[PDB]
Design a protein around this ligand. Sequence first.
Ligand SMILES: CN(Cc1cccc2cnccc12)C(=O)c1ccccc1[C@H]1CCNC1
Lengths: 9, 273
Amino acid sequence: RKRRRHPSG
Amino acid sequence: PLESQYQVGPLLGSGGFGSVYSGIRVSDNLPVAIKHVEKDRISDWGELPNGTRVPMEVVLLKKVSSGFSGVIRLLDWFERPDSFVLILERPEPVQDLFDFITERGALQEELARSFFWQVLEAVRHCHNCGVLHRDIKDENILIDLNRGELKLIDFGSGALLKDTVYTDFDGTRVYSPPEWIRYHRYHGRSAAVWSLGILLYDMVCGDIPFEHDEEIIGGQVFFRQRVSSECQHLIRWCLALRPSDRPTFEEIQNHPWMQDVLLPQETAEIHLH
Ligand SMILES: CN(Cc1cccc2cnccc12)C(=O)c1ccccc1[C@H]1CCNC1
């Protein structure tokens, strides 16, 4: 399962 | 002069927060992080006591950077024609909590308890200093791997803490609460507690629970890993749909799952070294 960062904004 | 006080090393990262370089203070070889933000890219502005116009982030870092804590310390800052430069502490050796969880997977509950406790103390410290972070997430947490201490970073989406409603938000959506998703309104403490529930799930399950707005407002927490009943209960309390049903910081830290926390040094020796 794809774990990813999430940019703010 | 910034060029003469700090020896500049490699780019550590860049994004909506600006560009951050590794660095070394020439005066005493103190490791620093050197953060550049373009003035045009700065949304919120504030004034220091002296009345100088600075980015809100500088204002917030000064309010929390007094003494020692689990918060990144602003050591200095400079204004340039088109940018501000921030000189920040740099733990060494360091890994951010996002990369740490990617590499290790779901954390043992003993380790998540120690980390979550330290994040709680760091956030209490911000709130005691009048500062609301508004972007609590694993990406914004550094681990000092030798000392076992967590450091909160990136106040570029924060605000002065207040008891009235916020109607603006520029933090991370997948950590924002359902009242923000549905109504574009939240109160500071209860929204922080929601983001802490997300963080705790992230720690004990290996990834955040929600990716989509519908999941955030749906009120259903499925546990994809083995998590104790006590820890599940704390997470579900932090993620109550109604803000007033969420625990205070005191209720979190008095929760049965939070008792008998490891010391930072114990944490490093057992889990990090
Ligand atoms: C650049 N950097 C590292 C970093 C940042 C701010 C202060 C620091 C102090 N000592 C060491 C490292 C420091 C990141 O941790 C990073 C990298 C890629 C993507 C995102 C991020 C963070 C920055 C804010 N939002 C997430």
